[PDB]
C-alpha cells in the first residue's frame, strides 16, 4: 500500500522515463493519499504540459496555489500554460511573479525564467 510520498517518487521515476500519462496517474494516486501537498499538483501539471493538456495543467496549478501561494513552479507552469493558450498578458505576469519569488527564495534556475519571459513578450508583440 504505497504512501503519497512513495507514489510521488514513483511518478518522478516515470517522468524521467518519459512515461507522462503514467506519471500523471501516479501523482493522482499521491493526491488520493494526501491531497494537501502542492507539489503533487505542480508535478502533475508539468506532465499535462508534456501531454498537451493545457487546461488540465492550468487547473492543477490553481490547486497548487491554493495550498502553497509561494510556489515558484506553480506560477512558472501557469505562465507556460497561458503562453501556449495565447493569454500573453497573464503569462507575462505569472512568469514575472515566478522570477520574483525565485529571487525571494534564493533559488537559481539559470536563465530559464528570463528566457520564458522574452518569449512571452516577443510572442505578445508578434501577435501585435
Amino acid at each position: 500500500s504505497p504512501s503519497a510520498q512513495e507514489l510521488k517518487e514513483q511518478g518522478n521515476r516515470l517522468f524521467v522515463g518519459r512515461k507522462y500519462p503514467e506519471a500523471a496517474a501516479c501523482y493522482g494516486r499521491a493526491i488520493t493519499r494526501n491531497p494537501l501537498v502542492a507539489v503533487y499538483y505542480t508535478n502533475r501539471a508539468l506532465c499535462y504540459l508534456k501531454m498537451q493538456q493545457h487546461e488540465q495543467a492550468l487547473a492543477d496549478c490553481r490547486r497548487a496555489l491554493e495550498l502553497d501561494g509561494q510556489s515558484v513552479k506553480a506560477h512558472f507552469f501557469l505562465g507556460q500554460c497561458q503562453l501556449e493558450m495565447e493569454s500573453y498578458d497573464e503569462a507575462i505576469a505569472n512568469l514575472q511573479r515566478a522570477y520574483s519569488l525565485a529571487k525571494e527564495q534564493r533559488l537559481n534556475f539559470g536563465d530559464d525564467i528570463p528566457s520564458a519571459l522574452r518569449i512571452a513578450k516577443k510572442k505578445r508583440w508578434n501577435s501585435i
Partner: peptide, 5 residues
C-alpha cells in the same frame, strides 16, 4: 525548473 519535485 522543468522537472518534478
Amino acid at each position: 525548473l522543468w522537472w518534478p519535485d
